Amino acid sequence: MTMHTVDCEGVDVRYADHLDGGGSDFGRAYVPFVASRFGKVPRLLEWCCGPAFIGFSLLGADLCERLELCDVNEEAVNVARATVAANGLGDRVSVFHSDCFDTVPADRKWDLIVGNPPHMNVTTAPAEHVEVFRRIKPELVYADKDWEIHRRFYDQVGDRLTPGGSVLLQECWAASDPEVFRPMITAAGLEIAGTFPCEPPHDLFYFLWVRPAA
Numbered sequence: 644m645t646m647h648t649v650d651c652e653g654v655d656v657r658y659a660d661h662l663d664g665g666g667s668d669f670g671r672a673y674v675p676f677v678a679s680r681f682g683k684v685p686r687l688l689e690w691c692c693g694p695a696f697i698g699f700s701l702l703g704a705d706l707c708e709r710l711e712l713c714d715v716n717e718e719a720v721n722v723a724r725a726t727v728a729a730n731g732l733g734d735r736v737s738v739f740h741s742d743c744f745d746t747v748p749a750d751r752k753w754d755l756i757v758g759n760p761p762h763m764n765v766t767t768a769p770a771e772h773v774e775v776f777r778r779i780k781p782e783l784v785y786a787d788k789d790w791e792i793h794r795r796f797y798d799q800v801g802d803r804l805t806p807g808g809s810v811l812l813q814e815c816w817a818a819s820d821p822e823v824f825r826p827m828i829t830a831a832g833l834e835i836a837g838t839f840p841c842e843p844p845h846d847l848f849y850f851l852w853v854r855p856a857a
């Protein structure tokens with residue numbers, strides 16, 4: 644109910660706790676990594692954006708010319724727009740309410756697609772895991788039962804990438820590893836170009852660099 648702000652690379656990002664997925668903490672890993680391995684990209688998209696701590700920080704550090712944001716939760720889309728307006732970022736940001744890419748403008752393609760998705764397949768996750776989040780966080784924040792959100796995403800993302808565009812997801816060692824996603828990446832016509840464990844103090848997390856296969 645109450646709106647807070649947290650500075651994400653100069654952007655005052657508006658959020659509510661129950662929409663917070665950790666992007667203002669371990670999502671901070673994104674700026675140094677993207678700045679070393681990609682430099683500034685013209686068109687960046689943050690999937691599963693929520694309040695877009697990650698996106699706004701990439702924008703705020705001048706790692707993208709345009710930043711676009713999309714999430715399935717309409718409350719997330721609206722809090723994200725609020726942040727656009729309160730930071731005067733209207734000319735450089737677009738927010739889309741969509742389940743993965745189902746209702747994202749059909750023309751839209753990106754050079755880099757980042758994202759802090761629901762991290763855990765609650766079907767197979769350890770009991771101790773699921774219970775820690777069932778009592779703390781809305782199910783939309785953490786739960787990808789049978790990895791189905793991931794599967795729709797990877798199946799759709801091929802046609803959403805500009806020539807030479809890549810995907811760079813931030814995942815959780817506790818709930819997955821690269822091999823878990825390899826079959827759905829290969830099926831979709833993509834490949835794992837790299838796995839980069841995040842450095843301390845976010846080494847619970849790793850980046851997955853995916854891109855269309857040869």
Ligand SMILES: Nc1ncnc2c1ncn2[C@@H]1O[C@H](CSCC[C@H](N)C(=O)O)[C@@H](O)[C@H]1O
Nearest residue numbers: 664665666691692693714715716742743761
């Ligand atoms: N099918 C789907 N399509 C788009 N977004 C989805 C989705 N399923 C879940 N999400 C969103 O994905 C986010 C994962 S939690 C991550 C929140 C935010 N990016 C942060 O770093 O804090 C949630 O906001 C959830 O609403």
